[PDB]
Design an enzyme around this catalytic site. Structure first.
Site, PDB file in Angstrom:
ATOM      1  N   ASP A   6      33.074 -40.898   8.565  1.00 44.46           N
ATOM      2  CA  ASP A   6      33.390 -40.789   9.888  1.00 44.46           C
ATOM      3  C   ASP A   6      34.953 -40.949   9.899  1.00 44.46           C
ATOM      4  O   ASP A   6      35.347 -41.698  10.648  1.00 44.46           O
ATOM      5  CB  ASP A   6      32.906 -41.736  10.779  1.00 44.46           C
ATOM      6  N   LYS A  32      33.406 -57.543  14.627  1.00 46.29           N
ATOM      7  CA  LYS A  32      32.671 -56.376  15.210  1.00 46.29           C
ATOM      8  C   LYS A  32      31.059 -57.257  15.127  1.00 46.29           C
ATOM      9  O   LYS A  32      30.717 -57.820  14.181  1.00 46.29           O
ATOM     10  CB  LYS A  32      32.494 -55.348  14.106  1.00 46.29           C
ATOM     11  N   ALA A  80      33.355 -51.696  23.339  1.00 49.80           N
ATOM     12  CA  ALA A  80      31.865 -51.843  23.390  1.00 49.80           C
ATOM     13  C   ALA A  80      31.137 -50.591  23.231  1.00 49.80           C
ATOM     14  O   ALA A  80      31.634 -49.438  23.943  1.00 49.80           O
ATOM     15  CB  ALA A  80      31.304 -52.568  24.325  1.00 49.80           C
ATOM     16  N   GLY A  81      30.147 -50.507  22.429  1.00 50.64           N
ATOM     17  CA  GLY A  81      29.233 -48.989  22.622  1.00 50.64           C
ATOM     18  C   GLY A  81      27.816 -49.115  21.992  1.00 50.64           C
ATOM     19  O   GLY A  81      27.437 -50.400  22.164  1.00 50.64           O
ATOM     20  N   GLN A  82      27.418 -48.169  21.386  1.00 48.94           N
ATOM     21  CA  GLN A  82      25.978 -47.736  21.025  1.00 48.94           C
ATOM     22  C   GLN A  82      25.580 -48.916  20.039  1.00 48.94           C
ATOM     23  O   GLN A  82      24.214 -49.372  20.093  1.00 48.94           O
ATOM     24  CB  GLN A  82      25.952 -46.574  20.238  1.00 48.94           C
ATOM     25  N   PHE A  83      26.452 -49.324  19.122  1.00 50.50           N
ATOM     26  CA  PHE A  83      25.828 -50.415  17.969  1.00 50.50           C
ATOM     27  C   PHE A  83      26.369 -51.845  17.878  1.00 50.50           C
ATOM     28  O   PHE A  83      26.199 -52.646  16.946  1.00 50.50           O
ATOM     29  CB  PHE A  83      26.329 -49.527  16.680  1.00 50.50           C
TER      30      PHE A  83
HETATM   31  C1  LIG Z   1      36.047 -56.498  12.947  1.00 51.78           C
HETATM   32  O1  LIG Z   1      35.775 -55.408  12.267  1.00 51.78           O
HETATM   33  C2  LIG Z   1      36.111 -54.307  12.970  1.00 51.78           C
HETATM   34  C3  LIG Z   1      37.213 -54.241  13.638  1.00 51.78           C
HETATM   35  C4  LIG Z   1      37.982 -52.913  13.901  1.00 51.78           C
HETATM   36  C5  LIG Z   1      38.782 -52.805  15.131  1.00 51.78           C
HETATM   37  N1  LIG Z   1      38.854 -52.326  16.148  1.00 51.78           N
HETATM   38  N2  LIG Z   1      39.888 -52.374  17.153  1.00 51.78           N
HETATM   39  C6  LIG Z   1      39.979 -51.870  18.488  1.00 51.78           C
HETATM   40  C7  LIG Z   1      40.322 -50.542  17.953  1.00 51.78           C
HETATM   41  C8  LIG Z   1      40.377 -49.641  19.507  1.00 51.78           C
HETATM   42  C9  LIG Z   1      39.154 -49.697  20.296  1.00 51.78           C
HETATM   43  N3  LIG Z   1      38.966 -48.771  21.716  1.00 51.78           N
HETATM   44  C10 LIG Z   1      39.751 -47.619  21.533  1.00 51.78           C
HETATM   45  C11 LIG Z   1      39.290 -46.966  22.607  1.00 51.78           C
HETATM   46  N4  LIG Z   1      40.268 -47.587  23.684  1.00 51.78           N
HETATM   47  C12 LIG Z   1      40.323 -46.705  24.930  1.00 51.78           C
HETATM   48  C13 LIG Z   1      40.023 -48.984  23.768  1.00 51.78           C
HETATM   49  C14 LIG Z   1      40.247 -49.480  22.407  1.00 51.78           C
HETATM   50  C15 LIG Z   1      38.974 -51.255  20.502  1.00 51.78           C
HETATM   51  C16 LIG Z   1      38.656 -51.975  19.192  1.00 51.78           C
HETATM   52  C17 LIG Z   1      40.814 -53.383  16.390  1.00 51.78           C
HETATM   53  N5  LIG Z   1      41.757 -53.825  16.708  1.00 51.78           N
HETATM   54  C18 LIG Z   1      42.319 -54.858  15.943  1.00 51.78           C
HETATM   55  N6  LIG Z   1      41.955 -55.089  14.955  1.00 51.78           N
HETATM   56  C19 LIG Z   1      40.696 -54.666  14.201  1.00 51.78           C
HETATM   57  N7  LIG Z   1      40.328 -54.976  13.167  1.00 51.78           N
HETATM   58  C20 LIG Z   1      40.240 -53.751  15.208  1.00 51.78           C
HETATM   59  C21 LIG Z   1      37.466 -51.794  13.260  1.00 51.78           C
HETATM   60  C22 LIG Z   1      36.610 -51.808  12.200  1.00 51.78           C
HETATM   61  C23 LIG Z   1      35.920 -53.082  12.225  1.00 51.78           C
HETATM   62  N8  LIG Z   1      35.026 -53.062  11.183  1.00 51.78           N
HETATM   63  C24 LIG Z   1      34.985 -52.382   9.938  1.00 51.78           C
HETATM   64  O2  LIG Z   1      35.656 -51.836   9.540  1.00 51.78           O
HETATM   65  C25 LIG Z   1      33.650 -52.469   9.247  1.00 51.78           C
HETATM   66  C26 LIG Z   1      32.448 -52.477   9.615  1.00 51.78           C
HETATM   67  C27 LIG Z   1      31.453 -52.818   8.529  1.00 51.78           C
HETATM   68  C28 LIG Z   1      30.294 -52.897   8.306  1.00 51.78           C
HETATM   69  C29 LIG Z   1      29.631 -52.819   7.085  1.00 51.78           C
HETATM   70  C30 LIG Z   1      30.583 -52.767   5.815  1.00 51.78           C
HETATM   71  C31 LIG Z   1      31.983 -52.481   6.019  1.00 51.78           C
HETATM   72  C32 LIG Z   1      32.270 -52.596   7.295  1.00 51.78           C
HETATM   73  N9  LIG Z   1      33.819 -52.453   7.972  1.00 51.78           N
HETATM   74  C33 LIG Z   1      34.880 -52.297   6.842  1.00 51.78           C
END
Ligand SMILES: COc1cc(-c2nn([C@H]3CC[C@H](N4CCN(C)CC4)CC3)c3ncnc(N)c23)ccc1NC(=O)c1cc2ccccc2n1C
Ligand SMILES: [Ca+2]
Length: 434
Positions: free
Chosen positions: A302, A211, A191-194
């Site tokens: 990014d 997300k 969880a974060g800013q956005f």
């Molecule tokens: C479902 O959407 C997304 C989900 C993730 C995602 N994050 N995490 C963890 C990573 C570590 C994190 N944390 C790190 C730090 N540690 C300490 C704790 C754990 C916790 C979360 C995941 N684990 C398993 N499967 C996943 N798919 C993810 C990333 C990007 C997007 N979205 C997009 O990519 C996206 C948005 C979007 C919006 C508009 C257009 C295109 C778009 N796209 C492709």
């Protein structure tokens, strides 16, 4: 009348999809891309099937030892995955000789260890195949049978085909926009800013990541048009965008990646056990996804290990492509910090910093330096020093990424190519054989 055979077992999970077993034949009623409408010849049921689970009867795809559309570098990866062994092989489509085929065999060199070797399979007229002119076969199937008993010149006699696991099922058909009601958000991952990221389930039988977007400055329609466009930019090294909930708050739905982020992964116990060649392999997969972005004339904006996701088989995929284009100075190029000139070349700068993250197993860039301190150091021409476990040649890639002039930075096409064959001399990519 068009008959396909099942390559894999499939269990139905939707309203109209059919279950089937490997070997089941089916009459094709429609070709609709991801899902085909078919009649099972086994059950006599009409319904939808994933088209990546079927191939035409007697086409090469139906063979255990044949891999359609698979590159030299993927052949090597698959053959080096757990489950395979000495002599494990595949026949595949030749990457550099369009229309022809190549053999890839698992080998072992004392001086270097487990390797994969490649042999050109030769075709002309006659409809025949040979690797070496003396040894000739009517079919590819005769070729594989030969090099299964004794290695006539080959590095290794063939044992069993490469391992395949079943492909990811395609997302449900006509389900780009879904009701929120379709989702159970089960575990908050972050969880974060956005917004937040959650482990979820879509209609009970599919694990996804979701997300959730805090309602912000951006419009709703303005956010969906980017997702809509992002969903068309599918690639094996970009996380799969499956679906969206269009009502505020916007949910974005992707495939779930079993190992979370590359950053957390590198820092984990299993992460610290990855030897340098693997770390290099990760970089090459990332460079591949960036080559694709680069070639489509897009920009990530990014790039960093926090935005790389790891599957349970350790496949790396770029995450948040598109998002930073709707919505961390240590990974950003000086032109981009100083003037907001974000380009493929500022992504290239970010890739060099990420390469350093990987080689240092997730250590923060510029350790002990603040953002201001970094800005000034780089202005004075400072660069991070080569870490201990870092070959000079890998470090030169990083340095080239960090050229102060963006025009002097390599392309990702060239980075990928360098990373892909980092331990292989050009001359040695393909074995010779009289
Ligand atoms: C479902 O959407 C997304 C989900 C993730 C995602 N994050 N995490 C963890 C990573 C570590 C994190 N944390 C790190 C730090 N540690 C300490 C704790 C754990 C916790 C979360 C995941 N684990 C398993 N499967 C996943 N798919 C993810 C990333 C990007 C997007 N979205 C997009 O990519 C996206 C948005 C979007 C919006 C508009 C257009 C295109 C778009 N796209 C492709
Ligand atoms: Ca050669």
């Amino acid at each position: 009348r068009i008959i396909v055979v099942a390559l894999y077992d499939y269990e139905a999970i939707h309203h109209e999809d059919l279950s089937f077993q490997k070997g089941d034949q089916m009459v094709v009623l429609e070709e609709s891309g991801e899902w085909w409408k078919a009649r099972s010849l086994a059950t006599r049921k009409e319904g939808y099937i994933p088209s990546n689970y079927v191939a035409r009867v007697d086409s090469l795809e139906t063979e255990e030892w044949f891999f359609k559309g698979i590159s030299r570098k993927d052949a090597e990866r698959q053959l080096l995955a757990p489950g395979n062994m000495l002599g494990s092989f595949m026949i595949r489509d030749s990457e550099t000789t369009k229309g022809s085929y190549s053999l890839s065999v698992r080998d072992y060199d004392p001086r270097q260890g487990d390797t994969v070797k490649h042999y050109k399979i030769r075709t002309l007229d006659n409809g025949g195949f040979y690797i070496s002119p003396r040894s000739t076969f009517s079919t590819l199937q005769e070729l594989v049978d030969h090099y299964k008993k004794g290695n006539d010149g080959l590095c290794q006699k063939l044992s069993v085909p490469c391992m395949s696991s079943k492909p990811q099922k395609p997302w449900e058909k006509d389900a780009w926009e879904i009701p929120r009601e379709s989702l159970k958000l089960e575990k908050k991952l972050g969880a974060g800013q956005f917004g937040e990221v959650w482990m979820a389930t879509y209609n009970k039988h599919t694990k996804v990541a979701v997300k959730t977007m805090k309602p912000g400055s951006m419009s709703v329609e303005a956010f969906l048009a980017e997702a809509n466009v992002m969903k068309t930019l599918q690639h094996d090294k970009l996380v799969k965008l499956h679906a969206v909930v269009t009502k505020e708050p916007i949910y974005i739905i992707t495939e779930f990646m079993a190992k979370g982020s590359l950053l957390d992964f590198l820092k984990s116990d299993e992460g610290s056990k990855q030897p340098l060649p693997k770390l290099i392999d990760f970089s090459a997969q990332i460079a591949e996804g960036m080559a694709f972005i680069e070639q489509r004339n897009y920009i990530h904006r990014d790039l960093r290990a926090a935005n790389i996701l790891v599957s349970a088989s350790l496949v790396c995929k770029i995450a948040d492509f598109g998002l930073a284009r709707v919505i961390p100075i240590k990974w950003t190029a000086p032109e981009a910090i100083n003037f907001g000139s974000f380009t493929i070349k500022s992504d290239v700068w970010s890739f060099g910093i990420l390469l350093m993250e990987i080689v240092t197993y997730g250590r923060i860039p510029y350790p002990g330096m603040s953002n201001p301190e970094v800005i000034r150091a780089l202005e004075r021409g400072y660069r991070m020093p080569r870490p201990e476990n870092c070959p000079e040649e890998l470090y030169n890639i990083m340095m080239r990424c960090w050229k102060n002039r963006p025009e002097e930075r390599p392309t990702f096409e060239y980075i990928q190519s360098v990373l892909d064959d980092f331990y292989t001399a050009t001359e040695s990519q393909y074995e010779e054989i009289p």
